[PDB]
């Protein structure tokens, strides 16, 4: 379909950029609207992304009324009617994150039918942590012709120790627990900012959720939740993507209203590399002198460690620094596909299992490249800014799941970039 | 788009099956036709596959005349004219194996322009072994706007120790060596049957290639090669796929004219599992009693070890054996994607890095599933034969690269299977 075309070199980025609401918070926040049996829920700062339109179809398919005012970045949900139980294959097959309606359907309805997710290109993503935790809460799981068929005669709390701090499983279990009998304790919980924002929404709806952001979340079940109005937290991955873009072009960019505390492990590694990062009244400013950039080691880890969703973009910055950088991806088994396409731009990298070694300063050239996944697409476009000549990036269906107007925002900062239909 | 629909649970396969010429031999054999400056080359037993049509476009684009008589399974090549140098992005981006014209173009023309391959879904596949070996032969490598630019002022032999026995790099280097000055020795060479068949063709064309099938290939360069007529070796992966299908359905199938020596590590593991494998005058017969199948351990390795191109299909057979089987995939890093789609059919598997553990005897159900790659597609269809209910397999573009008439061959053995347009 469309292509993004970048004229390489001389793309120093200068100016200010507005960041959308978080893709990875709005999807579970929309799932949470099913819990409210009284009042309507309004989410503000909603990003206009393909994944949001799909989740609105999933929630609407449960007999909730979903209205998306795109100009106002607002979604209104009326879940006060009789909620139904099915999340069909036609939606789950297009977006794995659809799975986070399982918990709220079980809490509100007591039974659910959710298509089992299949393979994902960036790694094996089994949902046993979701299903094991729900079984501990009294849910009987069957699987029939591709569907998870879940029944809770009397959903109840459980003391769950997570083998891994799964973001999606933590969200599913927290939401199921809000209307379960008694207390649920999730040990080794995901600590990501999106977990915190979901807990804020649930507490605004009349739930009793404590500890979000720590390794232990405690939920005290209640009889019913109420709708509320809530601003989606800023997208820290879109914010971090523009911080990386500023750093690798020797730019000076103000990322408007960026949250320092969400951006911590990225900001610390940018400061270690020699990038300047300044907290100002209107946002976080990122500036760099290209000759000051030094190679670093990064290891992706569950929050508060370095976020896997920033890894591909950070490897693009490692290409311009001085020395050999090392990126260790521990969260996803197969998230270095962008480094394979970057070979076409002249980038040599050494990949052994979960570790990529990248010598900075190689003389890259623009080439025709194809996106394999959302963050890989952004990493290819960022590398196109610094390569010599013209880069053409295709398979933009991936970029459109998580960035709104990426080429327009880069062009207003001074990049020679166009999106051609 | 097209779908394969399987009615499962009762699909004992009985009868005889014809196997096509090898997709992994015909592609390098077609590249080798560029070496012949006198006489035309005729390949017989050519399979009707999408990859063959692309390779015919690559070779035709070098100013060789390529005629494919599909009814006769015959390709005729006239490379006696002035051969050109470019293998463009529009072909390499659709088929990585296009890269094996680099060696023969350098041998025949002395310069080449070949699009650099990018990412592949089943694993990182860098071509450094190809380029390092060509540099040792006097080729100067540049990279410009996505293309490998290669020039050999006077191509010559080299004593190359391969870091890994790469099939494609071994093919590229042995073809380049045929017209180089002096002797080339490839240590730690690929030993696969497709290497042996390519060496047979080169020797029939007047080359001096010795040692194919062993860890050391020696090539003595000559001035020019001549066209010849050659039967493509039988596809041992299609043959092995029907051996696995017979075993997992408790069938009795004669795989016509199968070559025992090419099928060795697969046959030995089938015998260890309890399958009966009988060498007969018309082919290799595979029979099994389902209650006799026992779990086994398999590790993929370079030939003569167990072939990675049989791994996915063999994991489908592991689902019906008694006990816990283990599959270690050492050749590719991302080749367990079919096991994630198989969770939709009810299959639980434990995947840690390169190792998959599969408990046999789980009660699988048919579901709608999507192919991720060629051998994964075959593995999903085979699992559909034994699951209870209807399996629908999509994304058949992958299957069509390596199997001709797969659903028709299974239906004539008794499978309840249809390909719907
Ligand atoms: C991965 C990216 O999951 P999703 O697309 O989000 O369902 C995939 O399917 O490749
Ligand atoms: C792998 C399968 O290589 P190819 O398709 O053969 O070029 C890929 O590109 O996914
Ligand atoms: Cl389904
Ligand atoms: Cl021979």
Swiss-Prot record, chains A, B:
Active site feature: 120 (proton donor)
The protein's name: UDP-N-acetylglucosamine 1-carboxyvinyltransferase 1
Top EC class, one word: transferase
Annotated source species: Streptococcus pneumoniae serotype 4 (strain ATCC BAA-334 / TIGR4)
Location within or outside the cell: Cytoplasm
GO MF term (any one): UDP-N-acetylglucosamine 1-carboxyvinyltransferase activity
SUPFAM superfamilies in alphabetical order: EPT/RTPC-like (SSF55205)
Highest rank taxon of the organism: Bacteria
Pathway: Cell wall biogenesis; peptidoglycan biosynthesis
Transmembrane segments: none
Residue positions where 2-(S-cysteinyl)pyruvic acid O-phosphothioketal is found in the record: 120
Pfam families, alphabetized: EPSP_synthase (PF00275)
Chain sites annotated for binding UDP-N-acetyl-alpha-D-glucosamine: 96, 125-129, 309, 331
Function: Cell wall formation. Adds enolpyruvyl to UDP-N-acetylglucosamine.
InterPro entries: Enolpyruvate_Tfrase_dom, Enolpyruvate_Tfrase_sf, MurA_subfamily, RNA3'P_cycl/enolpyr_Trfase_a/b, UDP_GlcNAc_COvinyl_MurA
Gene Ontology cellular component list: cytoplasm
Catalysed transformations (reactions): phosphoenolpyruvate + UDP-N-acetyl-alpha-D-glucosamine = UDP-N-acetyl-3-O-(1-carboxyvinyl)-alpha-D-glucosamine + phosphate
Entry keywords, A to Z: Cell cycle, Cell division, Cell shape, Cell wall biogenesis/degradation, Cytoplasm, Peptidoglycan synthesis, Pyruvate, Transferase
Stated family: Belongs to the EPSP synthase family. MurA subfamily.
Binding site for phosphoenolpyruvate: 23-24
One Gene Ontology term from the biological process aspect of the record: cell wall organization
EC number: 2.5.1.7
